Amino acid sequence: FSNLAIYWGQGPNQLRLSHFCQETSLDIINIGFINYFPDMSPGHWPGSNFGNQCDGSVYVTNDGVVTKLLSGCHQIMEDIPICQAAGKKVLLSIGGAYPPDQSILSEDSAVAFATFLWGAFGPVAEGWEGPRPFGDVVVDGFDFDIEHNGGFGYATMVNTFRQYFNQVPERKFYLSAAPQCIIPDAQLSDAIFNAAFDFIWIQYYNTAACSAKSFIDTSLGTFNFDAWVTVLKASASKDAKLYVGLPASETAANQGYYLTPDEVESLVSTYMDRYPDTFGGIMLWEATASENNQIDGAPYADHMKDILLH
Numbered sequence: 444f445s446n447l448a449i450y451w452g453q454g455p456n457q458l459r460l461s462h463f464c465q466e467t468s469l470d471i472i473n474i475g476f477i478n479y480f481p482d483m484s485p486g487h488w489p490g491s492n493f494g495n496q497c498d499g500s501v502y503v504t505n506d507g508v509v510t511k512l513l514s515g516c517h518q519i520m521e522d523i524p525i526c527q528a529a530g531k532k533v534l535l536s537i538g539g540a541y542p543p544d545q546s547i548l549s550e551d552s553a554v555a556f557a558t559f560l561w562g563a564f565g566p567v568a569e570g571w572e573g574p575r576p577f578g579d580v581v582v583d584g585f586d587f588d589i590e591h592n593g594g595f596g597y598a599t600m601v602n603t604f605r606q607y608f609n610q611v612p613e614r615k616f617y618l619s620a621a622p623q624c625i626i627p628d629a630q631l632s633d634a635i636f637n638a639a640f641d642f643i644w645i646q647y648y649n650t651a652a653c654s655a656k657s658f659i660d661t662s663l664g665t666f667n668f669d670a671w672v673t674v675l676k677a678s679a680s681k682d683a684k685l686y687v688g689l690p691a692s693e694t695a696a697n698q699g700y701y702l703t704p705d706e707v708e709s710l711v712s713t714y715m716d717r718y719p720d721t722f723g724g725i726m727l728w729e730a731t732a733s734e735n736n737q738i739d740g741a742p743y744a745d746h747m748k749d750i751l752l753h
């Protein structure tokens with residue numbers, strides 16, 4: 444039975460997370476982004492951006508270095524557990540679109556980047572002494588939305604997280620990836636091939652050559668979900684569920700990539716029938732675009748769920 448994932452955190456004038464915690468149709472919420480990586484950011488701490496959510500306070504380290512990690516995200520801290528008591532999985536997303544100049548420079552820093560995020564946003568640990576930006580919150584895992592600068596270091600972060608997950612056997616944690624169509628994917632093919640993700644949502648918008656709309660109009664490009672299944676079945680990610688990532692309204696992505704619920708039904712019905720043990724559902728970019736695209740009294744994502752359930 445098939446799932447609906449959605450991104451929240453980067454919506455203009457977005458409602459707070461708890462508004463989406465109450466939308467039953469949501470299965471998984473990815474929260475973006477940890478958009479500053481340790482190698483290029485103050486103090487070698489990662490940094491975060493959550494739109495109108497946190498107050499804008501950043502941590503300053505014991506050394507008095509002013510970081511780019513937001514320290515005043517009180518609404519997110521309150522909201523994540525609500526979502527989790529509604530049975531949703533909340534994943535913390537790494538990367539996104541802005542800024543476009545972040546990457547990982549060494550395997551060492553790839554290990555420290557995952558260890559930092561696990562200390563900061565994972566279970567509360569006795570020996571941890573860094574920030575706890577969401578306090579006692581424990582996210583359900585991490586999403587890799589790497590959109591620039593190549594694929595170095597991410598397989599190592601994923602493998603690192605998994606080693607940590609295993610030290611905590613009583614709870615299942617999750618790893619996911621958001622690549623683009625154009626494959627190999629410059630940022631994430633290596634991670635996908637060489638590490639186990641639970642979920643992979645291919646972004647099927649913003650690239651003309653293989654978009655979801657090219658499914659509807661086959662002269663625009665060639666929709667390539669078939670090739671992606673073949674790649675996945677030889678990867679360390681062979682047990683991943685593979686989702687179709689879509690814009691939740693006309694303006695959530697560049698012109699021409701939004702599909703109407705009718706087009707969505709055609710695509711999804713073919714791919715769910717063709718790949719019943721691999722197809723995972725729909726990912727949506729993003730929560731605020733979906734909230735603002737009300738069709739017959741319900742947001743776009745409610746309609747996506749209805750499509751998936753039938």
Ligand SMILES: CNC(=N)NC(=O)NC
Nearest residue numbers: 453478492539540541542
């Ligand atoms: C799709 N990624 C984003 N929109 N990212 C940001 O707005 N980061 C500040």
Ligand SMILES: CNC(=N)NC(=O)NC
Nearest residue numbers: 450539540588621646728
């Ligand atoms: C412009 N970059 C994006 N829209 N990124 C995402 O949608 N990542 C899920």
Ligand SMILES: [Cl-]
Nearest residue numbers: 457458459462
């Ligand atoms: Cl609100």
